[PDB]
Amino acid sequence: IPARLRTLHNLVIQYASQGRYEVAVPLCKQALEDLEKTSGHDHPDVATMLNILALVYRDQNKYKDAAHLLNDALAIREKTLGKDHPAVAATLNNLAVLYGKRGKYKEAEPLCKRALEIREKVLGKFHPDVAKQLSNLALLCQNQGKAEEVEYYYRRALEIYATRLGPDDPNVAKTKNNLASCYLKQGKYQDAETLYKEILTRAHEKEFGSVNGENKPIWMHAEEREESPTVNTTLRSLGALYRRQGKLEAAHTLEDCASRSR
């Protein structure tokens, strides 16, 4: 936000979060035609202005129009700033968020790969912000039913989350679970069970010290009995996974464990 547009911003910000669409839009519209004569159209502050009103149309559910503004901001940003510049990836992302809210997922997908390619160059292939861009771009492929890609990007995100960050890490457990869902969505049940196990082995290794032969994880006590907020879901998922297999003496165990742990 520039110093110049910074005092008008706070007011529109205020006159939007008060449901005064009749006040806010003209304040933007007229402040844009003002700056349009000042520093030309292809100036970055028009692009910044076209992004603040675009966020006004998004704020009061007029997505058709919101994106019409963010493509214009993107055209300016592409011009002066650059084809592979960070602020152009930023507006290639905000524009993709709008396509998803309108249901145009097939149409947000090419924007999100470009927002990623800019991130891959800027931050480096293995940066954790690349892992969140991947965890996003996979959700988009899921909303398209492109399972094979959903699997790919989550695994790519997991590679960064697991390697760059720690083991107990929330994203490590969350991305495992998301990939574990994807595997089931495609009938890769051993792959899914494997993941649901890993999360728990670590979860038990976190609060019970370490994995022994006499102090094993829940799933191991459950598979033998048959003869983290993200963990309540793992327990519920894996539990019901044993249900498919017929392992009911093992399904009830985690289902009992899940209802207790809250």
Residue numbers in the entry: 194 to 420, 445 to 479
Manuscript excerpt for this entry:
Kinesin1 functions as a hetero-tetramer composed of a dimer of kinesin heavy chains (KHC) bound to two kinesin light chains (KLC). KLC is also composed of three regions: a N-terminal Heptad Repeat (HR) region that binds to the KHC stalk, a TPR (Tetratrico Peptide Repeat) domain involved in cargo recruitment, and a variable C-terminal region. The N-terminal capping A1 helix exhibits structural plasticity adopting two distinct and defined orientations relative to the rest of the TPR domain.
Interestingly, the three KLC2-TPR[A1-B6] molecules make the same crystal packing contact with a 2-fold axis symmetrical counterpart leading to TPR1:TPR1’ interactions. The two anti-parallel A1/B1 helices from each molecule are roughly perpendicular to each other and bury a total surface area of 1533 Å2 involving numerous hydrophobic residues. SEC-MALLS experiment reveals that KLC2-TPR[A1-B6] is a monomer in solution with a weight-averaged mass of 36.5 ± 1.0 kDa. Thus, this TPR1:TPR1’ contact alone is not sufficient to stabilize such a dimer in solution. Finally, because of the crystal packing contacts at the TPR1 motif, we cannot elucidate what component of the crystal packing contacts or the binding of the LFP-motif triggers the A1 helix reorientation observed in KLC2-TPR[A1-B6] (this study) structure.
